[PDB]
Amino acid sequence: CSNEECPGECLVTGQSHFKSFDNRYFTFSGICQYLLARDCQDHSFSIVIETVQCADDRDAVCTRSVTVRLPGLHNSLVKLKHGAGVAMDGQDVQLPLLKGDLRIQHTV
C-alpha cells in the first residue's frame, strides 16, 4: 500500500469524552471556556467551546455553546447555542444562510 494523508476528525460527545485529531481518547471534565481548535499558523479560524455542569452531580459536565471566529469574513462571531439556533454578531438568523464562502443549513 501507498501512504497518503486523509482527513482527520475531533469528536466531542458524552459528558466529557474527547478524541484528539490523531486517535487519542480521554476525559477532562472541566468547567470553563477552553480553546478547542485554531489555525495557529496563519490565523484563518478558531473554534472555542463553553462547558457547564449538568445532572446535579459531581462528575457530570456538558457543553453549552460553540463560538466560531473566521477572520476571512471581516471579523465574524458565529455562536451555536444549546438549541438548534444560530446567532451571528448578536442577531438571530433563519437558515439556510449563504455568503461569499460561508454556508449554514439544516440537515435531515
Partner: protein, 48 residues
C-alpha cells in the same frame, strides 16, 4: 446533614452550595435504580 456542632450550616446540597428551602435541598440527593426513574417532589398543596 453534615455532623459538626453548628446546626445552621446543615443544608449543604450535593454541589457544595448552601440553600434555604428544605425541598430543593432534599431533592438534590435523589438516586435512580434501573426501572426506577425519579421526578422531583413539590409541596403538598393542602391547607388545614
Amino acid at each position: 446533614g453534615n455532623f459538626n456542632i453548628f446546626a445552621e450550616d446543615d443544608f449543604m446540597t450535593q454541589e457544595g452550595t448552601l440553600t434555604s428551602d428544605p425541598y430543593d435541598f432534599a431533592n438534590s440527593w435523589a438516586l435512580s435504580s434501573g426501572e426506577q426513574w425519579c421526578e422531583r417532589a413539590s409541596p403538598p398543596s393542602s391547607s388545614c
